[model samples]
Target: KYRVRKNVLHLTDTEKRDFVRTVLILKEKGIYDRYIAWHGAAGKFHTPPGSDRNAAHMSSAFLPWHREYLLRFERDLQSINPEVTLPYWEWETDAQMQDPSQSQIWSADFMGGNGNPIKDFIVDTGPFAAGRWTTIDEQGNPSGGLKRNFGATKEAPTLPTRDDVLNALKITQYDTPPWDMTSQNSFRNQLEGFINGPQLHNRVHRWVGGQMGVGPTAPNDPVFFLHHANVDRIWAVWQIIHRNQNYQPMKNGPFGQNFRDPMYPWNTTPEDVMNHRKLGYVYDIE
Candidate 1:
């Protein structure tokens, strides 16, 4: 049966406890290390072949690629705890607050707060802290802990507003040519936060800073799944609203690869993941 992915805040106390416990189990067992490696590999799969930038980022394939990635991670989590499903972070809920850092999402019971100023942004508290966690870095190096410096930088002053999301959804086409970072009026470009105006995905990465801001190792932080889960939900919602409009790269690649092209490691392609329902899950929107 298909599981429902609800907002993190909407999860009941017991559900939240179970979710956190499952993540801790994965971290303890070193399964989470494998996910970090997959992300590192994706970053090097850029159009230029060996570019450090990820083919998933700043490309027409952004939404579909991430959807597949998150699905795999969710499957891994479910393998250990069948009841566990990836919950999304409704960033706008925190953005409306005076100080996002004060939101309960960052509490000791949840993802924990920002990093210590004296310790190079290394997260020193909460569930996934220094002694409790370690992750594979960009060069396959191991780090002692996760890090986050929320709103510490001007690059991400605030989260994207509801209007920002609506604007992106109104975009008719999925993506356009020169699909890298320069594509315009394209939903993929706008949502990827390369089209200027209130940033979406990229802004959150910068807002979190530290490990999240880094392209290759961003998934090292568990929050990556929550953030991308919401991003995937947005794409799903957009597709439903614009039912006739589908994924781009209608033909084989000269610039953007076709939707049927296989994403490495997995047998599936972008077209296979366009419908979340077909993938055996759906987002629980409220």
Candidate 2:
């Protein structure tokens, strides 16, 4: 059984900065290559060449994905320094939110995404990267080069066949009034809608190429963070409802196999995902 902890050890000021810097360095070098070597070609989805920037899509379920991603980093770190484990922000609990201007997360001052500051790893090299493909300074200026800077470019590649993915999952209709939250019965329906929603598929491409829209659009906007955060939270809630009301895990799992089994990658797998309660992480309701 997974060991449940009270709270995740969050990153310190120094650690956060270092972590971001390291991530940027690794990302610049090759994020997909570094972390996903074993699973790339043979596993489920292959991140094509130039598809190096796809990690941002994983950020939609930012909390969970980061939790796992950071855990991997923590494990790697522990191999070097056994004393260290993963640290978390508890951003909701902390009011100031790490205070970047104070150089809390990093030793040097806050450099924009492009400015190369101190020798350390934690530095913001780019903005949200949510389909915004520009290489701008911290204040968001176009520095030039091949940076697409959000939205679709001229010879953009076609997006993954999301319709095929939905069909493989065998979900026909999505919940009505997509993105509306007031309706009680429509929670699952809305989720179903999202699974097949155009926004999601489009966003997936955005995650890949910084494509804001089909045409040239503004930077996919930073607020996309909060928007996707809630999307992930809804899935958590849906799990609770399914486990309690419908007894989903005991039944033939929603995806055709036992979800509780350690093999699946969805919310039900303990081997793949940690408990939100144990991590002392929570999200706001919309």
Candidate 3:
């Protein structure tokens, strides 16, 4: 009871600054290396050698990998501050505000005008173009350089238009099988074009920033988990609608399915990623 009382006592401005500074100092000194360290130490989290070699390769695995990764971080945080729950920022919702700068999540260092090192997040079209949100490249998948070269081809597919994406998602077919990969792929393809393809991927980086834990970026920022939670939610919806595609699990043969390897930065396995229901969480969206 006394410990809970101490935890509830709000810190002063100076105290907050000191607290944050201390955390950052520890991070720089590698005091908090255990989170990522345990992930790598567990082994088997990375893609196996000589995988699919294409953009579509990791799609089957990225979501589950991160789910376990985030949960692990949540557990770690509880160990540190049992009273706290992981905070989640809804960036998509925040970015749409008329005065996004008014948001608490808006970094003070984030550029607000000319001469600022932080780019105007509001007008940052280039970042979105280069973002990696909808697509990922995992082991055995083609490299960013290869994708860029492929884009340079004469018969190279045209980049997707934003309107194409809005339509693809809104399609009544969203409730049916396959979700029309041609249209959906068109959306992804155009997103690749907007961002300069693999050469300068940006979406996922800008979205989560890093692992959904305390790190170089704001670990306390709620946006990190909210954004990823939504991403995971979408995957659940997609799986339900496209049940036929469910059989495409990582192949388990002598050569083994390289894509079967976990795609995120943690100790999760592809086999462990298949069911969101097992995680005791559900999406808020209808």
Candidate 4:
């Protein structure tokens, strides 16, 4: 609980500037590309062999896997600037805006504005403009740079609302049997946005479009960390609300989906990241 991850809207001007500056520094040092590689590599590691479930997504470890991912990233950021911590993009509140595109998050000073249509949806403003920030494809090669088309897809035209998060927290079990995407009444699956088919986390990715709309390349955008921090916050809230409910598949489940099983691309397991407070970090509201 030492590190407090605040909402993006709550960051002071200097904090925002420092955070963006630190991110740019990491990119230049090539430390950021390692994260891009880790995520892409994990995406290809299927659980239980031949099944759709992978180490990172389409499985129960989705929440904890990202929890560890964010923890490592926060530590790296701290290494550069101890005062800077991960900030979440509270898209649920942003959804209240009549035109979410007008959100301050897209301001040139912060995350920058939406992708320019004439530039073929390339983000041409902010610290991460097309030329400022580099991007990688699924094959881990240099791509056409960052792109974002907000609400351009009919499948996910809007962000998830606060009520959507509240309802998902009501779930009791961490995950159900089979431990795959089809599990019913499973909080993990719900928050991961597979239950109703891309309703929460997945919806946010799709709404962002560009590389964010896909799995492997989503982290190319700096907003990816902010988005997942919000997802991590939601999962932390669920753990608080459902204290009696522990991580599922303690035994007899997929190799990497079990409670103590080691998540691929890293030795950390779900048990290692089940508690956000224990990791020396906490969301502002918590």
Candidate 5:
């Protein structure tokens, strides 16, 4: 397969360095901030206005919207460094660690260690340390630092397990009626991790507190893409295994939640990104 996205732990030292360098370059050129802005914009663009469903999350488009997002991001990364494809943070597997904070992905050379309490939860290690990686506020202004406090919330004090990922993948329906966060028996909702609330995707966001814990400004952290990459990979696996199950609300659901409707802040639709392989990428495990 072309453009195989490798796990973060599998990346060679140079690969890691290249990836980090590319990101920092993108950040310096002010391109990376656009992703953060787009994510924030979409979060505010509630599909029905006053409803929970947004163009990106808490709806059937959760998977497809993010798939398009990552594809565009990968293209951007490719433009900078042709060989640098986005790597995923396998948090489910990392959960197996007794003290997951000590995982290799958090090493100084990689994603860096946790935020320092003395520094107001600002990440002081790795390439994205406070003075190095800059962040933006919801209004798209300089917020000054990349912050992270992993697994610090009571709601999501731990990462989702391998079984949790598998169980969500086991569901057959892409999504059911109503097509909002409350949709039951919906694979999209299950994997979106809203069925019981903060189970998979949502849990990961909360587990990595600071900017990631909030929806409007989640992409401020570089790890947001890695985490979403893993989420996308899980969806890709489900799409392959359940190839026949199409996205729900083929028509007559919320405007952005439908299969062919254009997701807000962009023209791309769920139908446009239905297949991962067609998007020209695959996970290493496949």
Candidate 6:
């Protein structure tokens, strides 16, 4: 059975401790490198250099694709610690705060703080810092430390607000062809932050620059899972609000697949992931 994912801030102190401990164990084993490598090799299977087949970014597959990814990671974590469930960062609460970096989530006991100005943006203070954790570099080689900027630079000046999320939720359509970043009136595009309204998903990434800012290797940072967990939650919320509608690419693709098309790395499709409860877990929000 899948456990419900609670808001990070709402988790009990012991729950938080277990969550961190589990993640650190996973990090030390270099499991994160598998995800980073997958992302780097994404879209290269049975498609041209610029093709979108099985590509996670700027595609209609973004939601279901990530849903499957998060589920796999959650399952891995559970294997090590059955009591743990992934928690989400309710970024809007932090966005409304005077300084997001000041949030307790960034404390050394938790995810740690911004990178040092003199250390190549490498985060030197936390459990996942230099000595405690290491990640695979772009070349798939092991590297000595994780990095984060945490709004220190102008790259991500602020976080997305509640209004921004609400605005994206108002969009009706799931996606439109060519089903890429330019598709307007698309909830997928809006939530993906490609339509320029709320900048919801992408903004959080930019806000937590460094490894998170690097598209292909963002998974190297443990925060990537929590951030995407919240993104997955928003997609669930959108599905409820528009229950009559479902996965897009309503028409068949070059591979003759549509809404029911099977997503890579998982035997499931977008239709299967539209309801998280059906997949064994539910978010605490609803």
Best by lDDT: 4
Kindly report which residue stretches of model 6 are placed more than 4 angstroms away from their true locations once superposed.
Answer: 43-49, 52-54, 152-155, 254-257, 265-267
Ranking by TM-score: 4, 5, 1, 6, 3, 2
How much is 137 displaced in model 3, in angstroms? 22
Q: Give the lDDT of residue 134 in candidate 6.
A: 77
In model 1, which runs have C-alpha deviations exceeding 4 angstroms? 50-54, 254-256
Superposed by TM-score, candidate 4 places the C-alpha of residue 275 at a distance from the truth, in angstroms, of 1.1
Q: What lDDT does candidate 3 reach at residue 226?
A: 38
lDDT for model 4, on a 0 to 1 scale?
0.91
Q: Looking at model 3, which ten-residue stretch has the lowest summed lDDT?
A: 142-151
- Model 4 TM-score relative to the real fold: 0.98
After aligning candidate 5 to the native by TM-score, how far in Å is the CA of 161 from where it should be? 0.4
Which candidate do you rate higher for TM-score, 5 or 6?
A: 5
Candidate 6 global TM-score? 0.92
**Number of clashing residue pairs in every model?**
0, 18, 19, 1, 1, 0
Q: Candidate 6 lDDT, tens digit per residue, 67-158?
A: 88888888889999987888998898889988788887887878888888799989988778887787777788877778888765464588
Q: Write the per-residue lDDT of candidate 1 for residues 133-223, one digit (tens) a residue.
A: 8767778887777888887767677888788888999999898876667788899989989877339989889889889988888988888
Q: How many steric overlaps does candidate 3 have?
A: 19
Native-referenced Cα lDDT, model 3? 0.34
Residue pairs of candidate 1 with colliding backbone atoms: none
Residues 67-154 of candidate 5: C-alpha lDDT, one tens digit per residue: 9999988999999999999999999989999988988888888788888999989999999888888788888788988788988888
Tens-place lDDT per residue, model 2, 100-133, is 2232221232112322223221223443332322
The 10-residue segment of model 1 with minimum total lDDT is 46-55
Off by over 4 Å in 3: 1-32, 36-59, 99-101, 107-226, 240-247, 250-267, 283-286
**C-alpha lDDT of all candidate models, in order:** 0.81, 0.31, 0.34, 0.91, 0.89, 0.79
Deviation from native of the Cα of residue 231 in model 3, angstroms: 2.2
- Which candidate number would show the highest TM-score if scored against the true structure? 4
